[PDB]
Amino acid sequence: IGIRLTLPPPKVVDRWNEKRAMFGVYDNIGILGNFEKHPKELIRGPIWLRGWKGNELQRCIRKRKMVGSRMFADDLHNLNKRIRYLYKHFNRHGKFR
Amino acid sequence: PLHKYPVWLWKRLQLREGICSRLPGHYLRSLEEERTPTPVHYRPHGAKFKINPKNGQRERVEDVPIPIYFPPESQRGLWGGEGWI
Amino acid sequence: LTYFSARKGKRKTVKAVIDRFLRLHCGLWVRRKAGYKKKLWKKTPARKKRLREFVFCNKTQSKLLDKMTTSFWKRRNWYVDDPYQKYHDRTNLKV
Amino acid sequence: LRNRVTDRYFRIQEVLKHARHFRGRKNRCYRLAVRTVIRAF
Amino acid sequence: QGGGARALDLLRGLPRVSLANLKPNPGSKKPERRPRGRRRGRKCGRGHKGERQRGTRPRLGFEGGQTPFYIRIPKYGFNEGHSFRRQYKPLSLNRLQYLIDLGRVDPSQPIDLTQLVNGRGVTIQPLKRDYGVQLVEEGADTFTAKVNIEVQLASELAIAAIEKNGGVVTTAFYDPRSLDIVCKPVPFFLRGQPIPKRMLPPEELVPYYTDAKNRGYLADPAKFPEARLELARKYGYILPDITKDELFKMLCTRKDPRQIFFGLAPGWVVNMADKKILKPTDENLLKYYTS
Amino acid sequence: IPDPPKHEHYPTPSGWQPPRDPPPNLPYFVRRSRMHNIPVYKDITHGNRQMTVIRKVEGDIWALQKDVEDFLSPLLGKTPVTQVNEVTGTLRIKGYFDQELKAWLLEKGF
Amino acid sequence: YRARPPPRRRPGPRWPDPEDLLTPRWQLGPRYAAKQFARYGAASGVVPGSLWPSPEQLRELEAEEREWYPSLATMQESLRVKQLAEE
Amino acid sequence: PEPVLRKVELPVPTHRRPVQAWVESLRGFEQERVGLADLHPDVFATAPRLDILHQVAMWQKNFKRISYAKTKTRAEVRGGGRKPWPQKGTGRARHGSIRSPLWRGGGVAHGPRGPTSYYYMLPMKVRALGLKVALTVKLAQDDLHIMDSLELPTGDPQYLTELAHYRRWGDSVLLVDLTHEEMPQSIVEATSRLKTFNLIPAVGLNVHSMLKHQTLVLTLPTVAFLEDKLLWQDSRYRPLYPFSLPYSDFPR
RNA sequence: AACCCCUAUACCUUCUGCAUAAUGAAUUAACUAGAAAUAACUUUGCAAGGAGAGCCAAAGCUAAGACCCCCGAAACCAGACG
């Protein structure tokens, strides 16, 4: 029970598909391009996460600030509750003070 | 998912569609224009800058209106901009 | 303490501490003595003089006051005619 | 990334291998065998 | 001659450096501690019951109910009005001399905030309530350069060191907006705003800057000869005649009190794209910027 | 960073000397920093570990260590405690010796 | 393969639609046009005359100056009077 | 045929001497030894810092990673508002909601909470040093080849494949021209049909590509570009504001 | 030589102390619990400066690594439905 009885379908990786072969190209776009662009401008993703990092409370606060006016009501309500929950957790509970 | 437009802009998007779109421009201008009401139930600063008496520094001041409730009966009379507080 | 603010995700300063203690850049904290303005009529001049001193905190209190204030309150300042200017740096201190 | 244990079978047999000569349910049921194998060692 | 080349030639005989044989520097990647296994699981470093094991101990500074240490000390205005006190980045005559000796500040031309910032001699933070540089005396004995330097505050002994070498020093006030512009001109020009007027000092600073003993930029020029003579008598040097020097014209260059940059007037727009300068000619505008 | 002007007399009023030309004939080399100073820094940990670091060392760093051992042995009365970091070209000494080491490396042509 | 063209800063001023409801209100002011002029100069297309305050704006600048920034003589006069009272 | 002799443009430290590489050509199979190029020792003979390569390789791999993994907490799973049964009396374990992480179909206690960013920035000087080290390492291990240009006699990929096999260039080759627009159309046609021979402009060079490919091919214009860009970081002041704004001597 | 011989007071939790006749557990499978600042430390870079405006600097400063759980009331309030 719990362990598969046949080998899984073999996994073939093309180590030289175009995505892998060109990975990292232009990561020095600033230092090699007269700093017209910053490498963070190459990051694609949510508008609230490009070239920025934080813990989960900071991300939720940042997402609420920037796209919160555009969120669906159920999702915005969950985000409000999540911020409140993390607010209590990070400010009032834990081993260290 | 996200909405393309902020929800608070949805009412304004509606005015660009349908019968509202075809309303006369001068009427549509009146709607958009949200002029500040004359202060009635609060006393305005009268200036943009004031000296903070506690620390003696020039600080900016703002007039924040007092929310007013206008009962439906006021829409049949002329209360001069007064309402319930 | 507020380790993470709801608006900025930043730790906040306890303003009670700012109103009572002075931080020297070297990491020492200076306080007044408790009761230096209370019932002076019953205190001896030797006691009154002790009560008027500006005194240093111990390591435990220093570490505590450091944690209750943010980094802004530890920066070197260059106030003109600061009465405490010479007390910001240590001299001849070994270990 | 959801990681689940995949070789738990082999972890279990490492105890059960020493319990096979015991009597009763403590020769096959890990919960019971693990305690009697520790005592045996 | 040795280890340097000994490493590159030692690399020739090794496998190729690839993405398969890299590693962090030893000591750079401390291991993670997880609550798993005998040593770190079970109670997992949190102790046994109480508030601490349950994660509910009181805030920082609370002492269990005893009126806490940070509350029972009396309030005293150590930090009252800290945010409106003016700060001055000190510039030493040791540091000024060093900047000149290394070629980072040019003594052949007037030295003001822009030249000290651009030579990376001082770092000014107007947002942290810096009001400029105070010229401090440290290094006065060994200071030899002759300069025309403009600071915001200057010590008498610092002034004596400047003037003993045949140099000139004036103290000038910069309001926080003017200070921000004078410190980073290029970012301001990228705002496309007319150059503003440099404001006057506040009252409490008007006596400092109208006083010749401070070489104030609003001080009476006719009173400077005496004040320069007093320091020479006080400190025992012979005041040089700077009118006789060939750089005398340079040594006399001073900005107008309402002027932020040498050679540029209030109300001009710097067009860095086309390398042009636009001057308004409207009378009302022109009167505003000259007033 | 501008290259330093030529001065009629050295050291300059500030005390700065340029590196010797031609470079000294030694197994190791100490390059100057981007601001043209000798790369000797004092460092502190734990509030009590006074340390001097010599950076930007080329060539044989084990020869530089022996020289620093022999220069500082008389001053200390014993052999200095040192770390040789071949990878980074850095010598680390226990104790503050920044001024002595600067004046000594400057008299070598570095 | 060959790499895609390097990502480059789209040249020239970016003038947004003053009608699209999703254009930031900060990209539509006179201050935004002033920055476009400063970055690109005449190629921006901004009339340079719009860079100085208008007559009504100039009146507001001068009024705030008179109220909050007194003359040198006024401040010297104030210090003289204040000094006599202390003396 | 006069040799192509490239000298270093930027001043070399007196105590150091330039390193050298054959200048080669892709115009024929045996057109090696077309010249001799000096290379700046501070760019092509720096200390071999593999620890810095790992730093820069990991910054490249991770700094742009956005994770999109996400689980629902007990707060976000559908329903689950009511207390399933009374606290006392039933002889069951006490439970507050059917979506606790103990229940099948419950919330996840400490699951991924994406989208999660991994953005960080190694100091610019470290990032520039990683480029030098990779170049120094390629030269030192005989994996670097300098060409005068990347022009081919034909745009046929088999030629470029056969040419690499003849010259013992390895399985993967990274071609660096100076500019994207001014790449010879022949090398563009050959590399576009290949998987392990990759053509990039100079501005796209990076530690991850140089490590992924076994062989690194640089035209001579590229070398001058690289020496200029990387040696600039060694002599620069600390910035006063972003280097994208006007400076006295920058760019060029 | 399976047993007979000899030795041997399940386990977890909880406790001053548990074979305890104290807790929990039929058993199997699967699921099910340590989240992060301050400072410090370690390892690089640059260094009287550092940092890709802001912020720090009386060897600092940048970067990185490394750190703070789970389930459970009786309640309280708001709006519905009876």
Ligand SMILES: [K+]
């Ligand atoms: K018992």
Ligand SMILES: [K+]
């Ligand atoms: K018991």
Ligand SMILES: [K+]
């Ligand atoms: K019981």
Ligand SMILES: [Mg+2]
């Ligand atoms: Mg039961």
Ligand SMILES: [Mg+2]
């Ligand atoms: Mg008991």
Ligand SMILES: [Mg+2]
């Ligand atoms: Mg029992």
Ligand SMILES: [Mg+2]
């Ligand atoms: Mg019990």
Ligand SMILES: [Mg+2]
């Ligand atoms: Mg039972």
Ligand SMILES: [Mg+2]
């Ligand atoms: Mg209540």
